[PDB]
Design a binder for these strands. Sequence first.
RNA 1: UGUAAA
Lengths: 199, 207
Amino acid sequence: KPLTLERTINLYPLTNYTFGTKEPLYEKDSSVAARFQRMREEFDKIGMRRTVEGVLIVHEHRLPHVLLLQLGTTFFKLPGGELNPGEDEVEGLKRLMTEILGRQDGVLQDWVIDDCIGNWWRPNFEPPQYPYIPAHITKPKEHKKLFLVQLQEKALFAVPKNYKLVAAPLFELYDNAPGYGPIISSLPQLLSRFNFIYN
Amino acid sequence: GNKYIQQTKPLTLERTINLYPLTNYTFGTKEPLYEKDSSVAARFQRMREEFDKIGMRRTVEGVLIVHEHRLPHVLLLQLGTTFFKLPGGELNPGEDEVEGLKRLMTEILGRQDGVLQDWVIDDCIGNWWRPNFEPPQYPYIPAHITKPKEHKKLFLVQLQEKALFAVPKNYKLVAAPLFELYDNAPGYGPIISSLPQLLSRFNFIYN
RNA sequence: UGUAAA
């Protein structure tokens, strides 16, 4: 069978991974309004924002869990961020993953990113995003591309102090846009096609 | 010699798919295809009996996509006013999923022409599991469910540039824009309404 | 899912 028809992915116990911390790494925007202001500034000058995010998966008791960065108590995001202009998507994601999650011991982590799982577009300088370019939207302000990041068997991660890292089970995310937004809450669907091996 | 350049990105990273105007396709009518069950009560009754003699039900469904003015539409079957379903149905025990789907596709939409109807089915887009003898299905196997009652598999069916389809007289055919499925999720159920999310990874060529 | 710990 083609990898196109069946895609097999190895998951490892959450306990295969040890998590340390590093110095805080704050977002470039300090508020929602600031975020859209900078989105506006840069659109004018570089064009559509290109964002990439990684979906790292571990299992617990043969159950897939997605790793999420928690900010405060009520906000969660996938590890990722903004591509520099002209930057390659996967190369850019590896860069961003190391920045946010890379161990500190000089041992450089090797990210395996071979799978695109989805795409979301932001038509305006506003919160709504859609898994398709909406009708007659010729100039989307942001394009967000999600990848499956296959974790090695064991790894060491370093979480900037300002974040917590959590492993959310799929049932927690499914049907829970009010808690995770439409992008994170539909990862269970986006991941369903994959043939997961537990270990 | 000459190097014939193919797509650089792996197929796992970039899946390119040709879509064609809905106007490229011819639609006709054929003999009605009645559902094997007469009522919800009958449905889960027959499902219970079969689980005992055949094991877990295995369903396959196909997602056929066309475009109108460069917006993707999924082809849906509508029964009466109240029910949308993807073309597909039940595998026989042991039947290959993809061969089964082609069988079912041909049966529900196949042209009664005498012309070869060939389906291109190279992509799995998702899996849904029914943990009890009840309607609810999940895009994952829930905790503590070792014996799901049904496994449903979704496939992307690539259409040729032109094709003829015959629709069973008792069904209507609908091309549903992705924004409809997404903006009005309640109307299509959890499987069809999350098709825009499941299709988003594809690089659709418009023609 | 948003800045109250962030």
